[PDB]
Amino acid sequence: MQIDTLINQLPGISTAPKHQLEKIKKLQNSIEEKQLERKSLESENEDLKLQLAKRIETFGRLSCVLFQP
Amino acid sequence: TLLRQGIRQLKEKVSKMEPEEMTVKEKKSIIEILKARIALKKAFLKMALSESNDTVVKKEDVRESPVDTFMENAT
Numbered sequence: 643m644q645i646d647t648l649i650n651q652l653p654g655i656s657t658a659p660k661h662q663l664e665k666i667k668k669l670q671n672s673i674e675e676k677q678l679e680r681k682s683l684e685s686e687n688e689d690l691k692l693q694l695a696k697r698i699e700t701f702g703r704l705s706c707v708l709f710q711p
Numbered sequence: 712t713l714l715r716q717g718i719r720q721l722k723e724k725v726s727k728m729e730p731e732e733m734t735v736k737e738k739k740s741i742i743e744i745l746k747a748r749i750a751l752k753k754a755f756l757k758m759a760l761s762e763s764n765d766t767v768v769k770k771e772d773v774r775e776s777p778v779d780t781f782m783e784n785a786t
Contacts, residue, residue: 704784711777 713749717742 654662724739726732758764 708777708781711773711780 712752714746717746 656662721739721742724735726735758767
């Protein structure tokens with residue numbers, strides 16, 4: 643009976659690999675577009691934020707100035 | 712404290728050169744016992760000393776200086 647119960651939910655109930663692979667094609671139509679796009683944000687951020695962090699270091703200079711009145 | 716008013720108040724408690732003095736002044740000596748233990752009220756030091764405490768004050772007067780400066784850096 644348990645066997646039948648796992649028969650009940652065979653993955654890919656559509657059972658159409660000819661078209662489920664097409665599903666994967668559309669999924670790549672999403673993912674392959676998203677690939678470098680999502681990672682481009684990394685450099686797009688650091689191009690500002692690294693220097694902004696050094697700005698944090700400059701107000702680190704001034705924090706050091708505040709350290710010793 | 713109590714001693715402070717007690718100086719100005721023991722001031723004129725004295726009554727002429729006559730033996731009117733000690734008749735009150737022995738009880739005044741009892742008051743002197745009392746104030747002798749008022750000295751015990753101030754038996755230990757809090758903050759250090761003038762002007763070393765005042766040096767702490769002027770130390771704050773230097774310590775106040777950054778406080779009046781960093782706000783200028785608000786923008």
